[PDB]
């Protein structure tokens, strides 16, 4: 069973910033650098 990220799944980083994907956005949304490249994941500061 191939799986694929899903709202409800949980991503973590090496510094213990666990959390659930709660919304996938289409690239039309998503903050993007000036060059055009979009970001990928939008992580909340209030977490820090």
């Amino acid at each position: 069973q191939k799986r694929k990220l899903q709202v409800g799944d949980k991503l973590a980083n090496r510094h213990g910033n666990k959390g659930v994907v709660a919304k996938i956005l289409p690239v039309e949304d998503m903050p993007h650098l000036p060059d055009g490249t979009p970001v990928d994941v939008i992580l909340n500061p209030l977490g820090v």
Binding site: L11, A22, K23, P31, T37, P38, V39, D40, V41, I42, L43, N44, P45, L46, V48
Partner: protein, 49 residues
């Protein structure tokens, strides 16, 4: 229930380094540990999301 699966990291007719990556593991990228992805991030609030 994770899916351990090896992938070849070496080409046909090549000299091998003593004891070097012939193949990768399940969470491995060319011999180094690969527990996930590095990916373009932005630390900001969205819209309550």
């Amino acid at each position: 229930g994770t899916a351990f699966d090896q992938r070849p990291r070496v080409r046909v007719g090549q000299r091998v380094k003593k004891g070097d990556l012939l193949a990768d593991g399940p969470a491995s990228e060319e011999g180094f540990l690969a527990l996930g992805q590095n990916v373009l991030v932005a630390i900001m609030p969205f819209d309550g999301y």
